[PDB]
Point group: C3
Chain length 210, copies 3
C-alpha cells in the first residue's frame, strides 16, 4: 500500500482504522498524514508530492474510492463522521480544502481549489484564475456527480442536488441548492441519513440543527 | 447463476436467454423474477432484498452492465425489445419504476425513484422528499449519461439529450428534451435505431408513431 | 497492434511510445500515421471498416483514449496536443479534427454522430445527419466536457468543466461555459504552467498578443 521517499515525513494512521486496497504515496519532505480512529479508507489512491503538506482525516470517517492529489504546502482537512463515496479531490497553489463534520458525499464528487493551469487577461496580461480555498461546512450532503470548484464555500446543513456544479459561494444554511446556474431551490430544511426516521425528532444526530 | 434466500421466491428465466456474467441475488419472501425469451442480460449485478419484490423483463430485452438495487415492496418492469447499456436503477420506499416497449438507454443512465435519504422541514420536522414512482414511456431513447430522478414520467417517443438531468415530468410526446434545466428543444419527431434507412417510412417498427 | 484485412498501412514513428495501447484495425485500405516523440499509452483505438484514416502529428501525448472509427472516417490530431482519459467516436463517413497544442482534460466525449436517426414527422426525413467536429488550435477542454456533432470551436478557447457543446462558436480567445453553453469571459489566453506571473513570461503565448 504505502510508499515514502523523503525526509521527516510523519504518518500516523490509527491502528483501529482500515485501509484495505488503499495506496498512499508521499514524495517530498516535512509532510504529515493523520488518520484514524475508527476510519475506513478503502480502495483509494492518495498522493502527496512536495513539502509541508498536511492530510488530516478525523475519527469515524469512511471513504471509498477517493483519488486524491496534493501538492506542496497544501492541506486537506476532513472532519469526523464524514462519509464519502467514489470521487476526486485536487489541491494545488499552496491552498486548502476543508470538509466539515458529518458530511455525506455521494459517488462522483469532484472537488478542487485550482484549475491547474493559468488563464490570463489579454487586456493587462495578468492571471485571473488564481486558486482559492474550498470550504465545505458541517453536515453537507452532496448528491451524485457534484462538482465543487475553487473558492466555493458551502454553509452548514445544506444539500446539493444531483449533478450540480458550484462556481460560487452561498451564505444561507439549511437549504437545498440545485440547478444551473446553481441556486437555492428550497429553504428551511435539515437532512438525515436514515429514511426510517419518520421525523427529524427521531434522529439524535439532528438535535443541534433544530 | 443466481443466489436465492427465503420463502415463496419465484424465479423464471427463459432457457433461450443469456445471462453471462450476471449476478442475481434475491433475499426475502414472496419475491418474483421474470426474464422472458431471447433476452441478453449480461455483466449485470441485480439485487432484490426484502419482501414482495417484483422484477419483470419482457422478451427481446438486452441489458449490459446494469447495476440494480430493489428493496421491499418495490417493482421494476421493462417491456419488450428495450435495450440498455451500462447504468444504475435504484428503487426503494416501496415504489415502482417502469420502462416501456422498445426503449434505448445509452451507457451512463442513473434512474431512481428515491433520494435514499430523508430531507426534513425545519418548520414542522416532517419529511418532504418522499419517494415517487418513475415511468419511462414506450420508445424512449436516453442519450449518454442521463439522470432520471424521482417522480419523473417520460411520454412515448421521446429522445433525452446527452447528459440531461430530469427532475420533473413532461407531457408532450414525439419530442427531444435536453439542456439544464431540461426542456423540450424539438417537437414533432420520431427516432429509430438504424442510420442506414432513408426515411421513417423505411422502418416498419415506427409505423405506429406517425400512423 | 492487431491488423486484419487488405492493404492497411500503419506507420508509427520508432521514436514514439505506445505502452499498454491496443490498436485494432479490421477492414481494408485503412491508414494510421503517428509522428515523432508521441506518447500514446493505455489507449484503445479501433478502426473497423474500410478507407479509414488516423493521423496523429508530432509531440502528441494521449493517456486512456477510447477511440472508435468507422468506414471512410478520419481523425486528425495536430502537433503538441495533450489528452487525458476520454472517448472519441466517428461514424457516418465523417471526420474530426483537433488542432495544434490543445489540452484535453480527463472525461472528454467527442462525437460527430448520434449513432441513431431522428426523423421529422412532417415529411419522414432524417434531420440529425452526422456533422464534422473541428477543434481549433490551442483549445483547452476542462474536465468532463462533451462535444457533439457539427461543433466548431475557435482558436484559444477554454471550455469550462462539465460543459456540453451542441453548437459552434465564432469568437476566439474566450471562456465558454454553462447550460446552455455561452461565452462567459472574453479576451483571454490560457497557458499550461502556473509558474508565470504574467502571459509575457510564457514564450509559447507570444503568438496570441
Ligand atoms: C437534492 C434533492 C435530495 C432534493 O429533493 P427535494 O427536497 O425532494 O426537492 P426537489 O428535488 O423535488 O425540487 C425542489 C425544487 O427544486 C427544483 N429542482 C430540482 N432539480 C432541479 C434542477 N436540476 N434544475 C432546476 N430546478 C430543479 C424542483 O423542480 C423543485 O421545484 P418546486 O419548488 O417548484 O417543487 C433531490 O433533488 C436530488 O438531487 N435527489 C438525488 C439524491 C441522490 O443523488 N442520492 C443518491 C445517493 S446519496
Ligand atoms: C438528443 C440529440 C440526439 C438531438 O439531436 P438533434 O435532433 O440534431 O438536436 P439538435 O442538435 O438540432 O438540437 C435541437 C435544439 O436544441 C438545442 N439543444 C440541444 N442540446 C442542448 C443542450 N445541451 N442545452 C441547450 N440546448 C440544447 C440545440 O441548440 C437546438 O436548438 P435550435 O434548433 O433552436 O438551434 C443530440 O442532442 C444528442 O444528445 N446526441 C448524442 C446522442 C448520444 O448520446 N449518442 C450515443 C448514445 S446512443
Amino acid at each position: 500500500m504505502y510508499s515514502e521517499q523523503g525526509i521527516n515525513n510523519t504518518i500516523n494512521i490509527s491502528t483501529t482504522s482500515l485501509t484495505n486496497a488503499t495506496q498512499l504515496t508521499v514524495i517530498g519532505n516535512n509532510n504529515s498524514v493523520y488518520i484514524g480512529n475508527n476510519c475506513k479508507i478503502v480502495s483509494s489512491n492518495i498522493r502527496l508530492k512536495g513539502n509541508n503538506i498536511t492530510l488530516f482525516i478525523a475519527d469515524d470517517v469512511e471513504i471509498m474510492g477517493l483519488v486524491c492529489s496534493l501538492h506542496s504546502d497544501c492541506s486537506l482537512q476532513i472532519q469526523a463522521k464524514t462519509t464519502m463515496g467514489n470521487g476526486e479531490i485536487t489541491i494545488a497553489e499552496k491552498g486548502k480544502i476543508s470538509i466539515g463534520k458529518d458530511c455525506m458525499l455521494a459517488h462522483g464528487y469532484e472537488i478542487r481549489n485550482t484549475d491547474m493551469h493559468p488563464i490570463y487577461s489579454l487586456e493587462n496580461g495578468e492571471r485571473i484564475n488564481h486558486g482559492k480555498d474550498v470550504i465545505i461546512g458541517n453536515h453537507v450532503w452532496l448528491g451524485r456527480n457534484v462538482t465543487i470548484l475553487k473558492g466555493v464555500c458551502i454553509p452548514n446543513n445544506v444539500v446539493v442536488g444531483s449533478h450540480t456544479v458550484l462556481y460560487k459561494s452561498f451564505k444561507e444554511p439549511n437549504c437545498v441548492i440545485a440547478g444551473s446556474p446553481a441556486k437555492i431551490v428550497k429553504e428551511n430544511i435539515v437532512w438525515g441519513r436514515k429514511m426510517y426516521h419518520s421525523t427529524m425528532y427521531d434522529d439524535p444526530t439532528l438535535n443541534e440543527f433544530y
